[PDB]
Amino acid sequence: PNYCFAGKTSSISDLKEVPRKNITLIRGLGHGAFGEVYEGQVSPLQVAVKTLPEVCSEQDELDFLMEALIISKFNHQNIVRCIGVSLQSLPRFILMELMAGGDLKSFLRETRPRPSQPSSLAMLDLLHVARDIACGCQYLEENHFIHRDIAARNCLLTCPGPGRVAKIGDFGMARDIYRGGCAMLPVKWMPPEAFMEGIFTSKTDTWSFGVLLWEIFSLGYMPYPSKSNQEVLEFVTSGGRMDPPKNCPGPVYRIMTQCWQHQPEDRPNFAIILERIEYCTQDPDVINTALPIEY
Ligand SMILES: Cc1nc([C@](C)(O)CO)sc1-c1cnc(N)c(O[C@H](C)c2cc(F)ccc2N2NC=CN2)c1
Numbered sequence: 001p002n003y004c005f006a007g008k009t010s011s012i013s014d015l016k017e018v019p020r021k022n023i024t025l026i027r028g029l030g031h032g033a034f035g036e037v038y039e040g041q042v043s044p045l046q047v048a049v050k051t052l053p054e055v056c057s058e059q060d061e062l063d064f065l066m067e068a069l070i071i072s073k074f075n076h077q078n079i080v081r082c083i084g085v086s087l088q089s090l091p092r093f094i095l096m097e098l099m100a101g102g103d104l105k106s107f108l109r110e111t112r113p114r115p116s117q118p119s120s121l122a123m124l125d126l127l128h129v130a131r132d133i134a135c136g137c138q139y140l141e142e143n144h145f146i147h148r149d150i151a152a153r154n155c156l157l158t159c160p161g162p163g164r165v166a167k168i169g170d171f172g173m174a175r176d177i178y179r180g181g182c183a184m185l186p187v188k189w190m191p192p193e194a195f196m197e198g199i200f201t202s203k204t205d206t207w208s209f210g211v212l213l214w215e216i217f218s219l220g221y222m223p224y225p226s227k228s229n230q231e232v233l234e235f236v237t238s239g240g241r242m243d244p245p246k247n248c249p250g251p252v253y254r255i256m257t258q259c260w261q262h263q264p265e266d267r268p269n270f271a272i273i274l275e276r277i278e279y280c281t282q283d284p285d286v287i288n289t290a291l292p293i294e295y
Contacts, residue, residue: 001062003069006143015068016084018042018095023086025049039098047083048099052092067175068094078136080156080169101157101164104129108152108220111160113293123249124287126216131277132166137209138270141202148200149173150208151189152215187229192237192262203264209273210259217252218245219291249286251279
């Protein structure tokens with residue numbers, strides 16, 4: 001099973017196999033549905049370890065290999081690094097850059113300003129996270145890779161504090177498509193032509209990014225509050241769009257509404273999105289806006 005990305009093809013033989021003896025598991029990280037994930041170390045190098053359960057289908061095996069190949073071929077500061085794999089021992093491992101800040105949705109929810117920590121986050125921290133991820137999306141778009149599942153839950157942070165860098169950290173949806181059901185589709189992150197016609201383009205990710213933006217500036221709320229998948233599908237196809245997150249500056253909301261343009265051709269590409277986010281970081285009225293302090 002081969003993988004093509006950019007102007008090169010790669011094989012399982014291209015994966016950097018790490019000697020199993022050199023790998024130590026330290027703690028579980030909230031192992032997702034399929035496959036457990038651990039914090040671990042390579043004889044010291046800090047890693048996240050994605051495991052393939054030994055009880056799996058041949059198809060599971062292939063998806064796992066594909067995931068390894070996809071992540072290993074990326075080379076960008078806002079895409080989580082692959083340190084290597086261990087496929088020659090069971091259970092099989094994929095080794096990733098450990099992102100000590102955890103996932104973005106948890107970070108936002110746990111770092112919301114409160115009367116005890118009213119200074120935890122500012123508008124500028126949110127814009128930098130947005131910029132980081134948009135930079136990762138731009139690298140994907142210019143390499144003609146469509147992510148298909150841009151969302152806070154799939155983004156990671158290097159550290160909780162001020163120097164944090166956000167990176168795209170999961171590629172499970174793109175993987176499944178390279179190789180399912182309605183109730184598993186990330187409907188709330190998808191533009192009309194995607195869930196209607198099954199058409200995906202770099203403009204598919206633009207729409208999702210807009211939704212990611214709302215997640216970020218809402219500080220980790222679920223998109224379309226109180227609506228189910230189908231209700232959202234009908235809301236959005238009828239021209240319905242989310243309101244601004246609480247206290248959200250107008251210039252930021254305008255980026256969202258441009259990302260959610262009904263026609264893909266009317267939506268910005270990530271180069272434009274980046275420029276608009278940068279202009280936002282420069283506007284004192286944007287970055288001097290206070291975030292809501294939840295009680
Ligand atoms: C240290 C650390 N803490 C995390 C918490 C528990 O979710 C809190 O933010 S994720 C995390 C953490 C740190 N670095 C990683 N390289 C990582 O990768 C896993 C495969 C991952 C990548 C994603 F893009 C999204 C979710 C997950 N998870 N998270 C749990 C299972 N898969 C997780």
